Every structure is written in C-alpha cells, then in structure tokens.
C-alpha cells in the first residue's frame, strides 16, 4: 500500500534527524574545551590588572 | 597569588628596612651627642691647662 510506504519514508526521516542529532551534539560536546579559553583568558587578564594595581 | 606574595614580601621588605634605617638613625644619633661631650670634655681640659696652677 503507498500509505505503509509513506510512513516508512516518514519514520526513516525522523530516525535519520536524531541519529545525525546525535553526531552533532556529540561533535558540539567535543568543541567545550577550545571554547573554554575564551573565558580562562579573560580569568588570566583580570588577575593581572589586580596585580598590576597591587604592585 | 604566588606573585601577589612576591609583591606584599617585598613591600614587607621594604616596610621593614625603612624600620631598620630609622632604628640605625637614632642609634647613630645617641652616638654623636656622647660624642659631643667627648668633644666638650677635650675642650674643658684644654681650658683647665691654661689653669697653671691646677695643671700644675
């Protein structure tokens, strides 16, 4: 029947969408550590300005 | 922090040699004014040797 054939077609959609979700997101869990520095760079230059008024 | 420790020891380094030079200063003090009256007692006897009589 075309509507079994359609909503496989659907379902193999959906099934595709999380399992390339998945890939993404873990890819995205991977990128935290280089997006880190961003910020323990700015902890760097905070305390040098404290330093630097300290001294 | 370790730094920071730098820092403060080394204006506690500093704090504490300003102490010392004050300390050295009235101690050096105390010696000129005794040398003074060693000063003074040298110029006494120097008069008391124009006293013929009790240098004599």
């Known amino acids: 029947s075309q509507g079994i054939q359609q909503l496989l077609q659907a379902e193999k959609r959906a099934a595709e969408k999380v399992s390339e979700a998945r890939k993404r997101k873990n890819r995205r869990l991977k990128q935290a550590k280089e997006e880190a520095q961003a910020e323990i760079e700015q902890y760097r230059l905070q305390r040098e300005k404290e330093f630097k008024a300290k001294e | ?56």
Not at chain 2, 18 to 39: E, F, G, S, W, Y
Not at chain 2, 41 to 49: E, I, M, Y
């Open chain 2, 1 to 56: 922090e370790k730094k920071e420790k730098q820092i403060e020891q080394q204006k506690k380094i500093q704090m504490s040699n300003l102490m010392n030079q004050a300390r050295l200063k009235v101690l050096r003090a105390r010696d000129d004014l005794i040398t003074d009256l060693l000063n003074e007692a040298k110029q006494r006897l120097s008069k008391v040797v124009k006293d013929t009589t009790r240098y004599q």
